[PDB]
Amino acid sequence: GLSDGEWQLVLNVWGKVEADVAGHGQEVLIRLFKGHPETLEKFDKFKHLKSEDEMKASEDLKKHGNTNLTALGGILKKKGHHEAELTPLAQSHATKHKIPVKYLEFISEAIIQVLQSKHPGDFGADAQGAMSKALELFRNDMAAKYKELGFQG
Ligand code: HEM
C-alpha cells in the first residue's frame, strides 16, 4: 500500500540494517523483551535470561535476532509482493509459536525504536513514516493469513 517512493525510503534504511543484521536483531529483541516482558515467555530458550546483561551475552539471542531480521528483510525487499515469503512465517507463527498479532505490533515498535536509536540522522520523518507503513502492511497481511488458517487476526 506504499508508493514506489515509500518503498525506496524503506529499502534505503534497511540498507543500514543489512550492514549489521545481527547487532540490529539483538537490539530489537532486547527492546521487545524489556519493553513487553510477557513476550519473552514465548521463547522457551530465553527464560533464564533475567537481565539485559544476560540478554546481551546470550549468543543464542543474537542468532535468533539475526534469523528474525534476515527474514523480515527478505519480506521488505519484495515490497508488498511478498506472499511467498510471508506465508511460511504466518504459518509457523500462527501454529507452532503461538504469536498473537498484538505481539507483532510490539516488535514493530521495537524495530522503529532501534532504527531511530542507531540511525537518527538517516531515519528522518519521511523514512519513519515509510517504515511504519511497511511494517503495518506486514502486520496486516500476517493477520489476514492467520484468519485464513483459522486463527485470530
Ligand atoms: C518481524 C516479525 C518477526 C519475524 C520476521 C520473525 C521471524 C522468525 C523466523 C525467520 C523464525 C525461524 C523460522 C520459523 O520458525 O518460522 C522465527 C522463529 C520464532 N519466532 Fe519469530 N519473527 C517475528 C516476530 C516474532 C515475535 C513477536 C515473537 C514472540 C513475541 C516470535 C517468536 C518466535 C519463536 C518463539 C520462534 C522459535 C524460536 C526457537 O527456535 O526457539 N517471533 N521467527
Side-chain angles (χ1 to χ4, degrees):
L2 287 63
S3 73
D4 291 357
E6 279 169 341
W7 283 121
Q8 291 308 297
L9 288 168
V10 171
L11 287 188
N12 292 352
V13 344
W14 198 256
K16 287 215 132 200
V17 175
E18 299 167 89
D20 175 26
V21 181
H24 283 71
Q26 179 180 242
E27 305 182 38
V28 165
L29 292 182
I30 285 166
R31 283 303 279 275
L32 179 60
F33 295 156
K34 300 301 291 145
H36 315 260
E38 73 270 31
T39 59
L40 176 63
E41 303 173 15
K42 297 294 179 161
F43 298 80
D44 293 328
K45 268 176 53 51
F46 309 139
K47 327 303 338 97
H48 68 291
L49 314 181
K50 309 300 210 48
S51 65
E52 165 159 12
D53 294 302
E54 303 180 9
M55 290 167 171
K56 286 196 269 196
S58 169
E59 65 177 44
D60 291 353
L61 188 145
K62 182 161 205 191
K63 303 199 179 324
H64 179 75
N66 186 255
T67 297
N68 176 313
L69 291 193
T70 295
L72 185 59
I75 292 173
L76 295 180
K77 281 174 188 203
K78 285 314 205 192
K79 305 174 307 185
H81 288 119
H82 60 213
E83 180 285 313
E85 284 85 10
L86 194 141
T87 293
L89 200 73
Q91 291 164 152
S92 83
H93 285 66
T95 71
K96 159 161 202 304
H97 310 313
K98 327 196 303 177
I99 306 309
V101 166
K102 168 218 308 139
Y103 277 12
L104 298 180
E105 288 170 8
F106 297 153
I107 199 173
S108 294
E109 170 192 73
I111 290 157
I112 293 165
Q113 295 170 329
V114 173
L115 293 174
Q116 166 69 42
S117 79
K118 296 176 81 71
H119 319 281
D122 274 278
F123 191 54
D126 285 351
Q128 285 167 34
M131 179 66 66
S132 293
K133 283 195 187 205
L135 294 172
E136 182 173 19
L137 177 72
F138 164 72
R139 296 193 298 288
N140 287 164
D141 287 353
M142 282 284 277
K145 191 72 176 162
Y146 273 43
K147 287 193 201 170
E148 169 172 318
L149 291 194
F151 302 102
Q152 193 86 104

